[PDB]
Write an enzyme that holds these catalytic residues in place. Structure first.
Site, PDB file in Angstrom:
ATOM      1  CE1 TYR A  26      48.338  65.443  68.902  1.00  0.00           C
ATOM      2  CE2 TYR A  26      49.471  63.412  69.466  1.00  0.00           C
ATOM      3  CZ  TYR A  26      48.302  64.107  69.234  1.00  0.00           C
ATOM      4  OH  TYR A  26      47.093  63.459  69.339  1.00  0.00           O
ATOM      5  CG  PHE A  36      52.320  56.383  72.770  1.00  0.00           C
ATOM      6  CD1 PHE A  36      53.629  56.747  73.049  1.00  0.00           C
ATOM      7  CD2 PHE A  36      51.295  57.240  73.147  1.00  0.00           C
ATOM      8  CE1 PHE A  36      53.911  57.958  73.646  1.00  0.00           C
ATOM      9  CE2 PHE A  36      51.572  58.450  73.745  1.00  0.00           C
ATOM     10  CZ  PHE A  36      52.881  58.809  73.998  1.00  0.00           C
ATOM     11  CE1 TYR A  82      48.000  59.555  80.700  1.00  0.00           C
ATOM     12  CE2 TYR A  82      49.835  60.520  79.505  1.00  0.00           C
ATOM     13  CZ  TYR A  82      48.481  60.310  79.649  1.00  0.00           C
ATOM     14  OH  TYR A  82      47.609  60.858  78.737  1.00  0.00           O
TER      15      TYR A  82
END
Length: 107
Positions: A26, A36, A82
């Protein structure tokens, strides 16, 4: 919902099911922002299984709608990963997530 844009090649039939531990190269990506996370950096490509809610919700449905050797392109909604909380310092609250997902797995 999770919206898939698979880069074509693979096999298209080895569907991920339960009782299966799979391997994903990923790459995290923030929309209107920078990276990130990237699994390719540490070169330990994140072995994990299916069904025990180890990963977040939007990555879980995106993992199921693939096959072997594919190269997907996730678009995770805020309310599945999130968007209410936001991971402290890393992920801001109410965020939209993009992932470069390649499933090169076993089982």
């Amino acid at each position: 919902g999770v919206e898939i844009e698979t880069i074509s090649p693979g096999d298209g039939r080895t569907f991920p099911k339960k009782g299966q531990t799979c391997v994903v190269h990923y790459t995290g990506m923030l929309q209107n922002g920078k990276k990130f996370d990237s699994s390719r950096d540490r070169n330990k490509p994140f072995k994990f299984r299916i069904g025990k809610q180890e990963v977040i919700k939007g990555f879980e449905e995106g993992a199921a709608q693939m096959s072997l050797g594919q190269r997907a392109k996730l678009t995770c909604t805020p309310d599945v990963a999130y968007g209410a909380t936001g991971h402290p310092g890393v992920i801001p609250p109410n965020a939209t997530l993009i992932f470069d997902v390649e499933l090169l797995n076993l089982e």
